[PDB]
Design a protein around this nucleic acid. Structure first.
Lengths: 88, 101, 119, 70
RNA sequence: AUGCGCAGAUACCGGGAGGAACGCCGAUGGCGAAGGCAGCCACCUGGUCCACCCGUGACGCUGAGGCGCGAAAGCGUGGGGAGCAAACCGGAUUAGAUACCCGGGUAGUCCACGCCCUAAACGAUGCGCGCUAGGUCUCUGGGUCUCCUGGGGGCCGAAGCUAACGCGU
């Protein structure tokens, strides 16, 4: 899965400041871990459609957050996709 | 890497040598797969509630172990290629839920 | 023929017939009987009375081998279960102990339309 | 009747080796007893059914018995 | 009655092979968006509920088209094949019986991969949010644990609604 220290690594890695757990960039990073792990799972378990529905939803929730950032701060919006390597 | 309970039921007709040969064949496999061993409990001879491999009884091993989760299947796979190995039942360890006081 | 002091009486009690087999302590048949083995034919072989005749026939045939007591093992639920049992008790031939061991799948094969009507 | 919970003190109903306790939860035909009879709660009985089954696979408990004196 | 049985069947005991389905637990129970999901074990993975009140700062709702999922039966390729069973082959029944009952039986039911895209796919009730008495049973959290307080499942039913039947936090 995804361990507390794995998560915590990624939170720190992205947090806008010390103690930030809920920023738009933290959220988008945490989502991306999940999507990536989940994507790996599904390339091997092609049949597991119930999970693939989870995936569609995460991806949705990602794209929505990104649209938000992109509109509030086209700058850190660009920072986040460089760092993550996605949406384009 | 998480904590499990390895159950083995062994053939009940073994002299100290054939018996402790199996065991060392087991401790081998166990190590070889990543399992350090917390507690143990050799309860050996117990009377089965139904005949297993034609036999009215079976010999009971019980390790408690930590090991890498992804090997746990592959271990018990191997663990049971032996003939005097009659059951391998490996179970994720668990908080002891209780009733009555 | 061999002496078998005691052994086993199997009642196979179906809706359509009752058969009784009597075996030595190891379950090898000694003698048997049934509704057909007595005079009856078809429908009557069911009937509690057929059961009686058959149990009695099987017992008397078996006392011939000097058999004197038996364990009973019943299988099925069928018009003649208990007559077959009461018959062995009343046959002389001492009944040591009755067990029901009717088989039952732990959910297994699809049954015939006949025994499925509960959908 | 009596309730099979009312006959015991603390027992780990996740302990699939304790045949002496675990066994008191089966019928004479060796079938998992209803809660009507066990006097456990839903949650508990769920964990019991799970542990008994384990015991069974291990050979320490019956799947069935023959009913005596029918 | 067809049928099976003296090439010894039925019943009974021992050994083996195989396929399919999981008794009791089992619920008026639970999970999932639906279809749907039930022996046990591991691993991979989806959703969701509670407490803390810590982070972001309206980032929300819905959703034409698109894309994905979608019971059964059916289609293709390759396996499998125990039991069941359209068709079909017989036996009865009948005024007749291309049926109901009985004995057989192929496709199919099972697996893998690719199709099909349907249904009484039903709560015959689209999705979200706010508001408007209560009682009682229940699953699952939390608390100061008579109870109080979330989230599910039920029934009775304030106000109200309804052609009525009913519906009714």
């Amino acid at each position: 899965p995804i361990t507390k220290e794995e998560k915590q690594k990624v939170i720190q890695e992205f947090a806008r400041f010390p103690g930030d757990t809920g920023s738009t960039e933290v959220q988008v990073a945490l989502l991306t871990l999940r999507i990536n792990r989940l994507s790996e799972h599904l390339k091997v378990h092609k049949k597991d459609h119930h999970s693939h529905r989870g995936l569609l939803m995460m991806v949705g929730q990602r794209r929505r957050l990104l649209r938000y950032l992109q509109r509030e701060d086209p700058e850190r919006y660009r920072a986040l996709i460089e760092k993550l390597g996605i949406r384009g | 890497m998480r904590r499990y309970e390895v159950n083995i039921v062994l053939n009940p007709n073994l002299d100290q040598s054939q018996l402790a040969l199996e065991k060392e064949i087991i401790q081998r496999a166990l190590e070889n797969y990543g399992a350090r061993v917390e507690k143990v409990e050799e309860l050996g001879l117990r009377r089965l509630a139904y005949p297993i491999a034609k036999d009215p009884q079976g010999y009971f091993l019980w390790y408690q172990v930590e090991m890498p989760e992804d090997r746990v299947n592959d271990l018990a796979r191997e663990l049971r290629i032996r003939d005097n190995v009659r059951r391998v039942m490996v179970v994720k360890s668990q908080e002891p839920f209780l009733a009555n006081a | 023929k061999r002496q078998v002091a005691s052994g086993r009486a199997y009642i196979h009690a179906s809706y359509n017939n009752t058969i009784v087999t009597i075996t030595d302590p190891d379950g090898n048949p000694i003698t048997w009987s049934s509704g057909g083995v007595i005079g009856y034919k078809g429908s009557r072989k069911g009937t509690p009375y057929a059961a009686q005749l058959a149990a009695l026939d099987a017992a008397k045939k078996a006392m011939a081998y000097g058999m004197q007591s038996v364990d009973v093992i019943v299988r099925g639920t069928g018009a003649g279960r208990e007559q077959a049992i009461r018959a062995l008790q009343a046959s002389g031939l001492q009944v040591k102990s009755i067990v029901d061991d009717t088989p039952v799948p732990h959910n297994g094969c699809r049954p015939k339309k006949k025994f499925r009507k509960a959908s | 009747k009596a309730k099979v919970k009312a006959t015991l003190g603390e027992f780990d109903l996740r302990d699939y080796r304790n045949v002496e306790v675990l066994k008191r939860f089966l019928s004479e035909t060796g079938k998992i007893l209803p809660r009507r009879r066990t006097g456990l709660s839903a949650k508990e009985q769920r964990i019991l059914a799970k542990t008994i089954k384990r015991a069974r696979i291990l050979g320490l408990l019956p799947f069935t018995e023959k009913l005596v004196r029918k």
